[PDB]
Structure formats: structure tokens, C-alpha cells
């Protein structure tokens, strides 16, 4: 046999690949790019005021933030129509933007008594157990009163320094600039960004009715306890009103067919595991199917969890003078994309099983497979030295370089050096004794010696495989 059985097993895979490709082409269009590009350039690439050149992307002080919040921010939220506020005369600013603050309390840490004459207070780094909850300043509104995480429908964020909660002191802004500017001025006069503040969030969203794509915008600013400002941004093109055009029904039908295909595969895998050979995991061709089906079922579960959860849109459509809460939907969309992008990768990778249709491809596959059993040991022995260099660099230079400021950053820096991108022109300033020594040793031992065993093993394996397959003709 081996032919009349594989032909069905091949066409069933080809149809699966076609459906997956249709889905991938469907979700990713070419209109999201320019949408997000203009949306980002409107807020990030514009100076706070015409008399300086410090944009939100390069904030450096607590004072610059106030210049930003009344400035390039208000100028890019409210556009006078030739009341509603269309950003680019196409994008609709639905709802109102909301600002929020996360801060810690006075006396959150301890100082020694021998120098407790000059140090009058300390503000410890942000922690859920050290977060202030008392009302400060003038106790008028929601901007000076703590609010629990469940009363804001919020969640965690996982910023750059730490993972911030969903609570804090929040404030909703108006619809016209005339009142939003007054509110911001009121916040700035009665000092609101004190020394105790640790994080600030700004959130809003737009519609852009021409195409059907919501865009949710979040801006984070972090204040480390050691001083400084760290900005971050996130623009997400969500889509929530899918069924309008025929292509949408086409995509839904392809999704249904995809679910049917994955159900078929899981059934034929359970049948094979139970009604046939047990513990068939020494193949790498069946350990790939389980990964694909698990990733697919996780993606389907996430889609069912998220798509069926859209009542927040209905609540916003009831009254459209309140802040819409679309933060969870963007997070789940990001998670769904991160899963689909890996699923399609493995689906494409699986195609290698189907290419043995002549001598050359078969022998290349044999060489590639036989060369994996022994490359594994050298890969481990090489990665051990790689991590040794990584930890050495992290311990030595990981305090002044900022390219080695984190372990994974050290790994990426080493890989970039391997590609030939990073030069040590700053390492001497970082260190003059152990800098050039480390650089020379790394670029000599792991680029002239260690990196050639990979070539040697492959070269020898291919040579012996070809010689064996040629000798396989002296017997026949």
C-alpha cells in the first residue's frame, strides 16, 4: 500500500492548510497598519508644546507630564467639526477618556535612627501591601478617594517595573475641551502627582466608522522610587461588530469548517492512541500532532470565552456618556493572536512529512534526521557555556551598561554580537579591566572554535550518509 492510504491523509492536510491560510489572510488586513500608524503618530511623535521638542515618547520629569496632559493630548482628542469629536474627521471618540493614579503611603519603609534626623519620610517601591488607601488632599470627588479593583472592573497590567493593580484614584473627563482643561487645571493646582505617586494610566477608544475596527488606546507612565519617568503605550485594533458583509459570513463558515477539522483530527488521534500502539511517542511526528491539537483547542476555547463576552458594548450603547471598559477584550485579542501565530507555524512545519517523492529529498531528510541525535549533546554543552557568559556579563556589566541590565537582555545582546551588530565602544566606559577581556574571550572561543563543531558534525554526517546510500548500489 503506502500510496492509496497516504493520498487521503495528504488531501485532508492540504484542505486544513487552505482553511488556515484563509483564516490568517482574513484576520490580518492591510488597513490596520495605517490606522494604528496615524493613531500612534498623533500622540507619540508630536512635541508637548511648540517651544520644546520633548514628546511623550521621551518624557524625563514629573513636570513634563503635566505639560503633556494639557497640550499635545487635549489637542489630539478634541477636533472642532467644520457634542461629537471626530479625531481625523473619520475616527469617532466614543465615550470619554479616563485618567487614573496608583500611589503608595507615607512611612512605608524603615530608616535607621542614627540618621533619622534628616530623613523625614520614605516612599517604598510599589507593592499591594504598601498601597495607600486613605483620602488625601481635598475630599471632594472620586479623584481623592480610594476605589477597590472590583468597583472599577479593572485588572492587572504587568508594566515594565512591576505588575500594577486595577485600583487607584481615577477621574472621568468631559466631552468638550473647555471642561477637560478646567478639570486638568484643578488637578494640577491642588497637587495631585505628589512624591508618593507610582503609576498613571490614561485610557480611551475610537471607532473610525468607515471600516469596522474599534481602536483602544492605553498610555502608562511609571515613576520608580529612585526617581525618573518611564513611558509606555498600547494601541489595539479590536473588531466587535463582525457580521455586516458577506466576507464576514464567509469567515464564520471557514471557522466552522476549522472546528470540524480539528474535531476530526482529535477523534482520529484518540482512535489511534487507544485502539492501536500505546506509548507511540518515539516518533516526533505524533508529538507534533498533540501540540497542534492542544494549541487549536486552546485557541477555540479563548475565542468562545471572548467573542461571547460582549455585553460591555451593549452597556456602553445604553448610555454613551460614560467610559467604555474595553481593556479585557484587547488583552484577550492579543492572547488569541499570540496563539494563532504559533499554531500556523507548526501547521506549516508539519508539511515536511510529505516531501519524500524522490531520492534527493529522501536523502536530505535522512541526513537531517540522523544529524539530530548527536547535535543534541553539543547543543547542550554550547548552551551551558552561553549561559555562563550570560550570567557573568549580567553580574559584571549589569549595573551600568543597560544592554546587560537583565538576564534575557544579556542573552539577546550575545546573540546580536554573534550576528555582528553590537560593538564594545561603551563597555570600556563600563569597565576597562574585565570589558575587553570578556569581549575578546567570547568572540574568540564561541566564534572561532565552538561555532565550527556545528559545521563539522553536519559535514561528516552528510558525507557518511551519502557514501552509505551510494554503497547501497554496489549490493543491488
Amino acid at each position: 500500500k503506502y500510496l492509496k492510504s497516504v493520498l487521503r491523509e495528504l488531501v485532508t492536510y492540504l484542505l486544513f492548510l487552505i482553511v488556515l491560510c484563509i483564516l490568517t489572510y482574513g484576520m490580518m488586513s492591510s488597513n490596520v497598519y495605517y490606522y494604528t500608524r496615524m493613531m500612534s503618530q498623533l500622540f507619540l511623535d508630536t512635541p508637548v508644546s511648540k517651544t520644546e521638542k520633548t514628546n511623550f515618547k521621551t518624557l524625563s520629569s514629573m513636570e513634563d507630564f503635566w505639560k503633556f496632559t494639557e497640550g499635545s493630548l487635549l489637542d489630539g482628542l478634541y477636533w472642532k467639526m467644520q457634542n461629537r469629536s471626530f479625531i481625523f474627521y473619520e475616527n469617532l471618540l466614543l465615550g470619554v477618556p479616563r485618567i487614573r493614579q496608583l500611589r503608595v503611603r507615607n512611612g512605608s519603609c524603615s530608616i535607621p535612627q542614627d540618621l533619622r534626623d534628616e530623613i523625614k519620610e520614605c516612599y517604598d517601591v510599589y507593592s499591594v501591601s504598601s498601597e495607600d488607601r486613605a483620602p488625601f488632599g481635598p475630599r471632594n470627588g472620586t479623584a481623592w478617594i480610594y476605589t477597590s479593583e472590583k468597583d472599577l472592573n479593572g485588572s492587572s497590567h504587568w508594566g515594565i517595573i512591576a505588575t500594577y493593580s486595577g485600583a487607584g484614584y481615577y477621574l472621568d473627563l468631559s466631552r468638550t475641551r473647555e471642561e477637560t482643561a478646567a478639570q486638568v487645571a484643578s488637578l494640577k493646582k491642588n497637587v495631585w502627582l505628589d512624591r508618593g505617586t507610582r503609576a498613571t494610566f490614561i485610557d480611551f477608544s475610537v471607532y473610525n466608522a468607515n471600516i469596522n475596527l474599534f481602536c483602544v488606546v492605553r498610555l502608562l507612565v511609571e515613576f520608580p522610587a529612585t526617581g525618573g519617568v518611564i513611558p509606555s503605550w498600547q494601541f489595539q485594533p479590536l473588531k466587535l461588530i463582525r457580521y455586516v458583509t458577506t466576507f464576514d459570513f464567509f469567515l464564520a463558515a471557514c471557522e466552522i469548517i476549522f472546528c470540524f477539522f480539528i474535531f476530526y483530527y482529535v477523534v482520529e488521534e484518540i482512535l489511534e492512541i487507544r485502539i492501536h500502539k500505546l506509548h507511540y511517542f518515539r516518533s516526533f511526528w505524533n508529538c507534533l500532532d498533540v501540540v497542534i491539537v492542544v494549541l487549536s483547542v486552546v485557541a477555540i476555547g479563548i475565542n468562545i470565552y471572548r467573542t461571547s463576552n460582549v455585553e460591555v458594548l451593549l452597556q456602553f450603547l445604553e448610555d454613551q456618556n460614560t467610559f467604555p471598559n474595553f481593556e479585557h477584550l484587547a488583552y484577550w485579542q492579543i492572547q488569541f493572536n499570540n496563539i494563532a501565530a504559533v499554531t500556523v507555524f507548526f501547521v506549516w512545519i508539519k508539511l515536511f512529512k510529505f516531501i519524500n517523492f524522490n531520492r534527493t529529498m529522501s536523502q536530505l531528510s535522512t541526513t537531517m534526521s540522523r544529524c539530530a541525535k548527536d547535535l543534541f549533546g553539543f547543543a547542550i554543552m554550547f548552551f551551558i557555556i552561553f549561559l555562563a557568559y550570560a550570567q557573568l556579563a549580567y553580574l559584571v556589566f549589569g549595573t551600568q551598561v543597560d544592554d546587560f541590565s537583565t538576564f534575557q537582555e544579556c542573552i539577546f545582546t550575545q546573540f546580536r554580537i554573534i550576528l555582528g551588530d553590537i560593538n564594545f565602544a561603551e563597555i570600556e566606559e563600563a569597565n576597562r579591566v574585565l570589558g575587553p577581556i570578556y569581549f575578546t574571550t567570547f568572540v574568540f572561543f564561541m566564534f572561532f572554535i565552538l561555532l565550527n563543531m556545528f559545521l563539522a558534525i553536519i559535514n561528516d554526517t552528510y558525507s557518511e550518509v551519502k557514501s552509505d546510500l551510494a554503497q547501497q548500489k554496489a549490493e543491488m
Binding site: 507593592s127 499591594v128 501591601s129 512591576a162 505588575t163
Partner: peptide, 29 residues
Amino acid sequence: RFVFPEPTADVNYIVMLTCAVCLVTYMVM
């Protein structure tokens, strides 16, 4: 006479390293 602290998120690397060493030595042994 008991407490479920869960106060912070700053992990203590000493216990993690000790446990990792104690399991790695067991595996190799």
C-alpha cells in the same frame, strides 16, 4: 495561631536556589 500572609511578590531567591540544587543533585545521583 496561623496566617496566610501573601504580602508581596518579591520572590526570595535563596529558597528557590536551595530547592533547585537539592533536586538537581538528586537527579544526577
